Design a protein around this ligand. Structure first.
Ligand SMILES: CC(C)=CCC/C(C)=C/CC/C(C)=C/CC/C(C)=C/COP(=O)(O)OP(=O)(O)O
Ligand SMILES: CC(C)=CCC/C(C)=C/CC/C(C)=C/CC/C(C)=C/COP(=O)(O)OP(=O)(O)O
Lengths: 292, 288
């Protein structure tokens, strides 16, 4: 009797009830509650004017990008110890870091599974899987560097050039993934999508300081954001020792003190002019398209 | 400026050998102590009948070694384990952020190795599908294990629930290995056998754990599951509740740990129940 139950278990595919699906989906369902700006989704609709994928294929590509985007935020908020995401408590503080890590990773592989419902043309299929794998590798390479510079500061002080190659991997990754899949499926805008990704990341960095995640949470997180990279390299270059050191000291506190965060922003505004430099840099990238 | 940007966006992302070493640090750390290599030695034994060519067999081994070691990095973060293979866990040295990312990164470097197994598009499709299905099963198994543990005492798993979970959590990488080998073989499936091997392997691991860190971690191990269900069934409220209180302490007190280990040994006889259950499983194969 014990034997037959073991036999039945080992001789059949692993069983998975919808009740269990609901238990381990909690972390992800929570983040779905507040949709974001849907910038990537709208980007997908627009781009389809030229690519012309059938409604059904397009829905799958959208689902894949939404799964990857949202799960990547679940992981990034654990990796940054972020208290808020889209104005609500982050999933890992509600369900725990362990379940949130496993759920986000599980969703990466469900996104992978959807890639098969895109086609049966073995030539195409292979190319699709390859695009997915390459860009998931690129995403993790960039995320890995961003995380390393932040957690081991001041071991490595990146240069503007180093930051830009990191963003090409980290932020450029899902934008290139989306576009490469759609382009592969069309009955090249990658360079434009790379620039768009760089502008998106630097702008996010800029706005987090200029201005829901909390007041300037990138400082509390110790991030080597575009403005900070400019500030540290500017102070190094000009021999501004006291301030170079104060920028590093503040980043290392991982502080939520609102006055210390503003102190740091004012050093960028008045001592290194890092805010004006970043605002200008963004406009210079945007003009490359406006002047195309 | 415009020129530099132009070259950046028109080229593949820049990634160096040094960058690769920086992000590999947490993985390289756990590979400093080999472990027993049960899975890779298993692969060799099984190839005696699968006869894969040495180069494909090596890629299967690499895929399995990357998944096994990256899964340990993640499992250790998920139960905040202080030690793995006699040394400090990677996340306590490189931090949780870098260790999550590196382990997740290696999951995809393992995926990439699957297209190096074959050029035949029919077979490739099959291999990728096998990899995808079992990574899904592994996460369903690991998510239930984590769920029951972190949500205790909401759900006390039964013996059958534990067995289904373990077949995915631990049996999952054993099945991936064998499915990939059977798919590639140039020569009856061994999946039922490997599923039972995975189950025995985990129950045996739970048994041996009893540092008894599974206690400090609040784990619903095979012996604990037997003890909780045993006490419930017999109306032994006090013992049932005592086992739960100790698990819920997430204690590092050796004295309190010994106390639970004795309840399991002398009051519920879970250690003996466990040992005999393993033997019953081993005979299921032997006596065949
Ligand atoms: C699976 C993926 C995509 C990545 C794996 C590796 C990881 C965790 C990378 C982190 C990638 C990341 C979070 C980059 C930052 C991109 C960015 C600016 C996100 C925020 O985009 P919004 O459009 O502002 O967010 P909403 O959806 O709330 O509007
Ligand atoms: C990518 C994979 C495999 C899974 C994804 C989801 C996760 C993180 C699952 C957890 C899987 C896990 C760690 C199961 C336990 C397996 C086990 C009993 C490991 C210990 O095996 P040993 O053979 O004693 O280890 P050594 O390598 O040190 O010898």
């Amino acid at each position: 009797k014990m034997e037959a139950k073991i036999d039945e278990l080992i001789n059949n595919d692993p069983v998975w009830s919808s009740q269990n699906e609901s238990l381990i989906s909690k972390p992800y369902n929570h983040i779905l509650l507040k949709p974001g700006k849907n910038f990537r989704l709208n980007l997908i609709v627009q781009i389809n004017r030229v690519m012309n994928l059938p409604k059904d294929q397009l829905a799958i590509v959208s689902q894949i990008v939404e799964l990857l985007h949202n799960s990547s935020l679940l992981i990034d908020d654990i990796e940054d110890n972020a208290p808020l995401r889209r104005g609500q408590t982050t999933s890992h503080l509600i369900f725990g870091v362990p379940s949130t890590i496993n759920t986000a990773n599980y969703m990466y592989f469900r996104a992978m599974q959807l890639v098969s419902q895109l086609t049966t043309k073995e030539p195409l299929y292979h190319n699709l899987i390859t695009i997915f794998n390459e860009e998931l590798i690129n995403l993790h390479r960039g995320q890995g560097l961003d995380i390393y510079w932040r957690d081991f500061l001041p071991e490595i002080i990146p240069t503007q050039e180093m930051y830009l190659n990191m963003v090409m991997n980290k932020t450029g990754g899902l934008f290139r993934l989306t576009l490469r899949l759609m382009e592969a499926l069309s009955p090249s805008l990658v360079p434009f999508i790379n620039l768009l990704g760089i502008i998106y990341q630097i702008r996010d960095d800029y706005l987090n300081l200029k201005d829901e995640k909390g007041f300037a949470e990138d400082i509390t997180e110790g991030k080597l954001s575009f403005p900070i990279v400019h500030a540290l390299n500017f102070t190094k270059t000009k021999g501004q020792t006291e301030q170079h050191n104060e920028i590093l000291r503040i980043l290392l506190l991982r502080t939520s003190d609102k006055d210390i965060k503003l102190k740091l922003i004012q050093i960028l505004e008045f001592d290194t002019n890092s805010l004006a430099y970043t605002k200008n840099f963004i406009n210079q990238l945007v003009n490359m398209i406006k002047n195309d």
